[PDB]
Design an enzyme around this catalytic site. Structure first.
Site, mmCIF file in Angstrom:
data_model
loop_
_atom_site.group_PDB
_atom_site.id
_atom_site.type_symbol
_atom_site.label_atom_id
_atom_site.label_comp_id
_atom_site.label_asym_id
_atom_site.label_seq_id
_atom_site.Cartn_x
_atom_site.Cartn_y
_atom_site.Cartn_z
ATOM 1 N N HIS A 11 -50.133 -13.097 -14.593
ATOM 2 C CA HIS A 11 -48.739 -13.235 -14.968
ATOM 3 C C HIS A 11 -48.005 -11.921 -14.789
ATOM 4 O O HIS A 11 -48.488 -10.887 -15.206
ATOM 5 C CB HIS A 11 -48.695 -13.677 -16.423
ATOM 6 C CG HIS A 11 -47.308 -13.804 -16.998
ATOM 7 N ND1 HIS A 11 -46.910 -13.121 -18.132
ATOM 8 C CD2 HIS A 11 -46.233 -14.529 -16.590
ATOM 9 C CE1 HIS A 11 -45.658 -13.461 -18.428
ATOM 10 N NE2 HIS A 11 -45.225 -14.310 -17.502
ATOM 11 N N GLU A 31 -48.430 -14.262 -10.147
ATOM 12 C CA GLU A 31 -47.053 -14.664 -10.304
ATOM 13 C C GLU A 31 -46.217 -13.386 -10.350
ATOM 14 O O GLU A 31 -46.594 -12.422 -11.023
ATOM 15 C CB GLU A 31 -46.938 -15.492 -11.583
ATOM 16 C CG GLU A 31 -45.458 -15.969 -11.794
ATOM 17 C CD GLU A 31 -44.675 -15.108 -12.788
ATOM 18 O OE1 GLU A 31 -45.321 -14.301 -13.466
ATOM 19 O OE2 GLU A 31 -43.435 -15.249 -12.899
ATOM 20 N N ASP A 33 -42.012 -11.837 -10.366
ATOM 21 C CA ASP A 33 -40.611 -12.210 -10.606
ATOM 22 C C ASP A 33 -39.747 -11.633 -9.521
ATOM 23 O O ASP A 33 -40.032 -10.536 -9.034
ATOM 24 C CB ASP A 33 -40.164 -11.679 -11.953
ATOM 25 C CG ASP A 33 -41.096 -12.165 -13.055
ATOM 26 O OD1 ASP A 33 -41.019 -13.365 -13.332
ATOM 27 O OD2 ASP A 33 -41.948 -11.378 -13.558
ATOM 28 N N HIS A 47 -38.870 -8.112 -14.054
ATOM 29 C CA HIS A 47 -38.659 -9.113 -15.104
ATOM 30 C C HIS A 47 -37.619 -8.649 -16.139
ATOM 31 O O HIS A 47 -36.635 -9.342 -16.433
ATOM 32 C CB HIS A 47 -40.017 -9.365 -15.780
ATOM 33 C CG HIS A 47 -40.027 -10.563 -16.692
ATOM 34 N ND1 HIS A 47 -39.336 -10.598 -17.898
ATOM 35 C CD2 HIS A 47 -40.658 -11.762 -16.583
ATOM 36 C CE1 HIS A 47 -39.523 -11.776 -18.476
ATOM 37 N NE2 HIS A 47 -40.358 -12.490 -17.718
ATOM 38 N N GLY A 48 -37.861 -7.501 -16.751
ATOM 39 C CA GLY A 48 -36.975 -7.002 -17.787
ATOM 40 C C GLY A 48 -37.230 -7.652 -19.141
ATOM 41 O O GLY A 48 -37.996 -8.614 -19.297
ATOM 42 N N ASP A 52 -43.251 -11.302 -22.145
ATOM 43 C CA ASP A 52 -44.414 -11.678 -22.943
ATOM 44 C C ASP A 52 -44.869 -10.536 -23.856
ATOM 45 O O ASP A 52 -44.803 -9.339 -23.486
ATOM 46 C CB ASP A 52 -45.596 -12.077 -22.042
ATOM 47 C CG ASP A 52 -45.672 -13.570 -21.814
ATOM 48 O OD1 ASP A 52 -44.718 -14.278 -22.155
ATOM 49 O OD2 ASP A 52 -46.724 -14.034 -21.338
ATOM 50 N N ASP A 91 -41.395 -16.268 -8.932
ATOM 51 C CA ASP A 91 -40.583 -16.765 -10.036
ATOM 52 C C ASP A 91 -39.189 -16.295 -9.698
ATOM 53 O O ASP A 91 -38.872 -15.113 -9.850
ATOM 54 C CB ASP A 91 -41.081 -16.173 -11.349
ATOM 55 C CG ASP A 91 -40.297 -16.622 -12.543
ATOM 56 O OD1 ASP A 91 -39.329 -17.376 -12.349
ATOM 57 O OD2 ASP A 91 -40.680 -16.208 -13.662
ATOM 58 N N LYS A 93 -35.665 -15.608 -10.068
ATOM 59 C CA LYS A 93 -34.789 -15.498 -11.240
ATOM 60 C C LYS A 93 -33.361 -15.766 -10.767
ATOM 61 O O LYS A 93 -32.533 -14.867 -10.623
ATOM 62 C CB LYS A 93 -34.933 -14.093 -11.830
ATOM 63 C CG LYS A 93 -36.382 -13.746 -12.307
ATOM 64 C CD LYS A 93 -36.698 -14.602 -13.564
ATOM 65 C CE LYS A 93 -38.145 -14.308 -14.103
ATOM 66 N NZ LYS A 93 -38.351 -15.178 -15.384
ATOM 67 N N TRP A 224 -48.807 -22.262 -18.817
ATOM 68 C CA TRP A 224 -48.535 -20.821 -18.987
ATOM 69 C C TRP A 224 -47.960 -20.584 -20.395
ATOM 70 O O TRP A 224 -47.502 -21.519 -21.018
ATOM 71 C CB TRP A 224 -47.497 -20.337 -17.918
ATOM 72 C CG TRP A 224 -46.146 -21.028 -18.017
ATOM 73 C CD1 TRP A 224 -45.769 -22.203 -17.398
ATOM 74 C CD2 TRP A 224 -45.027 -20.611 -18.815
ATOM 75 N NE1 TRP A 224 -44.453 -22.526 -17.761
ATOM 76 C CE2 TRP A 224 -43.987 -21.575 -18.627
ATOM 77 C CE3 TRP A 224 -44.757 -19.458 -19.558
ATOM 78 C CZ2 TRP A 224 -42.677 -21.414 -19.205
ATOM 79 C CZ3 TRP A 224 -43.482 -19.312 -20.161
ATOM 80 C CH2 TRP A 224 -42.454 -20.280 -19.958
ATOM 81 N N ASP A 227 -53.425 -16.760 -23.187
ATOM 82 C CA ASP A 227 -54.141 -15.492 -23.360
ATOM 83 C C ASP A 227 -55.293 -15.643 -24.339
ATOM 84 O O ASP A 227 -55.886 -14.648 -24.732
ATOM 85 C CB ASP A 227 -53.220 -14.357 -23.838
ATOM 86 C CG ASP A 227 -52.137 -14.012 -22.813
ATOM 87 O OD1 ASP A 227 -52.328 -14.342 -21.635
ATOM 88 O OD2 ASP A 227 -51.087 -13.429 -23.178
ATOM 89 N N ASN A 246 -51.969 -13.371 -19.023
ATOM 90 C CA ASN A 246 -51.883 -11.918 -18.947
ATOM 91 C C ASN A 246 -53.247 -11.297 -18.867
ATOM 92 O O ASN A 246 -53.339 -10.112 -18.552
ATOM 93 C CB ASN A 246 -51.167 -11.365 -20.192
ATOM 94 C CG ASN A 246 -49.707 -11.798 -20.230
ATOM 95 O OD1 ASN A 246 -48.924 -11.494 -19.276
ATOM 96 N ND2 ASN A 246 -49.328 -12.526 -21.283
HETATM 97 N N1 LIG Z 1 -41.508 -18.623 -14.732
HETATM 98 C C1 LIG Z 1 -42.570 -18.623 -15.739
HETATM 99 C C2 LIG Z 1 -43.264 -19.983 -15.597
HETATM 100 O O1 LIG Z 1 -43.951 -19.995 -14.362
HETATM 101 C C3 LIG Z 1 -41.906 -18.369 -17.122
HETATM 102 O O2 LIG Z 1 -41.120 -17.184 -17.075
HETATM 103 P P1 LIG Z 1 -41.908 -15.829 -16.678
HETATM 104 O O3 LIG Z 1 -41.009 -14.725 -16.248
HETATM 105 O O4 LIG Z 1 -42.803 -15.463 -17.966
HETATM 106 O O5 LIG Z 1 -42.949 -16.246 -15.501
HETATM 107 C C4 LIG Z 1 -43.603 -17.509 -15.536
HETATM 108 MG MG LIG Z 2 -42.115 -14.791 -14.281
#
Ligand SMILES: NC1(CO)COP(=O)(O)OC1
Ligand SMILES: [Mg+2]
Length: 278
Positions: A11, A31, A33, A47-48, A52, A91, A93, A224, A227, A246
């Site tokens: 993640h 994954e 962003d 991400h910013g 998580d 992902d 945004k 998702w 953990d 994570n």
């Molecule tokens: N897009 C998700 C789901 O796939 C949720 O937001 P995120 O930035 O934690 O990444 C994963």
């Molecule tokens: Mg994401």
């Protein structure tokens, strides 16, 4: 029966150095962003805050730098090649874009992936790619991406591309979005919530039920962000194909438990991520 292949999805892998970090802990997928600038061009892997629990939210690259790093990690013969890394979820945004920029964003994304990831078809990175879109109304991004690859003369790279709508929408609403987009396979269905908050399995069970029905539309389901070992066992018991985490080592440890080794295995490049498991 045969073991279900499982994608262990690292993640929020947004700095080039984190690719090795997550794969070396056991992830066969990551994954990442993708933020967009005011013209719908991918700009950063950023991400910013908020993000998580337990994570630094602010590691990032210029998007095309990350793509070049991802290409090194996924190109056989490169000094940094990771044979295990077989799927990347972007992902997207698109929250910062006007709805009528969704198609443009797809085209710009395709140009960057073609140039920096697939290297214009010259020995590019081999991982499969999921374009994950958080807003069902941004489905025109998909057609933009495909039409840009086609204009640039590489429509065949769509064979390496799949789709996710990550907003936890009603599953019927998701299917209608895909119908409007004219999409009829390569579909992953995310379900989940930040690791900071609790969540039940109702919608992931419904996604699995759709995937395993004769006329459903979902090919693969991933949960998702997971953990904890107990949540991992629950998600595997519910029959998911992917687990975003994570901590890839936690997921790996559960999959190496004797009872789970009999029913699951870590997916490799020869597992087609677009095919429903039977
Ligand atoms: N897009 C998700 C789901 O796939 C949720 O937001 P995120 O930035 O934690 O990444 C994963
Ligand atoms: Mg994401």
């Amino acid at each position: 029966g045969n073991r279900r292949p499982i994608w262990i999805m690292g993640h929020m892998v947004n700095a080039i150095g984190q690719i090795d970090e997550f794969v070396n802990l056991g992830a066969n997928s990551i994954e990442t962003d993708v933020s967009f600038d005011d013209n719908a061009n991918p700009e950063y892997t950023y991400h910013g805050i908020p993000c998580d629990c337990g994570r630094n939210c602010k590691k990032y690259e210029n998007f095309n730098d990350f793509l070049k790093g991802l290409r090194s990690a996924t190109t056989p013969g490169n000094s940094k090649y990771q044979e295990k890394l077989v799927l990347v979820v972007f992902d997207l945004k698109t929250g910062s874009l006007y709805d009528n920029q969704a198609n443009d964003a797809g085209k710009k994304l395709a140009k960057n992936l073609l140039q920096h990831y697939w290297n214009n078809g010259n020995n590019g990175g081999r991982a499969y790619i999921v374009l994950s879109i958080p807003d069902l109304n941004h489905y025109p991004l998909i057609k933009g991406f495909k039409d840009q690859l086609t204009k640039d003369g590489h429509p065949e790279l769509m064979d390496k591309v799949g789709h996710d709508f990550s907003g936890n929408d009603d599953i019927g609403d998701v299917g209608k979005a895909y119908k409007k987009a004219g999409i009829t396979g390569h579909i992953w269905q995310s379900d989940g919530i930040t690791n900071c908050l609790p969540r039940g399995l109702s919608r992931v069970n419904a996604a699995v039920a759709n995937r395993d029905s004769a006329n459903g539309f979902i090919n693969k389901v991933y949960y998702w962000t997971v953990d904890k070992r107990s949540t991992t066992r629950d998600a595997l018991d519910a029959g998911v194909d992917g687990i975003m985490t994570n901590y890839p080592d936690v997921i790996t440890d559960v999959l190496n438990e004797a009872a789970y080794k009999k029913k699951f295995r870590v997916a490799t490049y020869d597992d087609n991520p677009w095919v429903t498991f039977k």
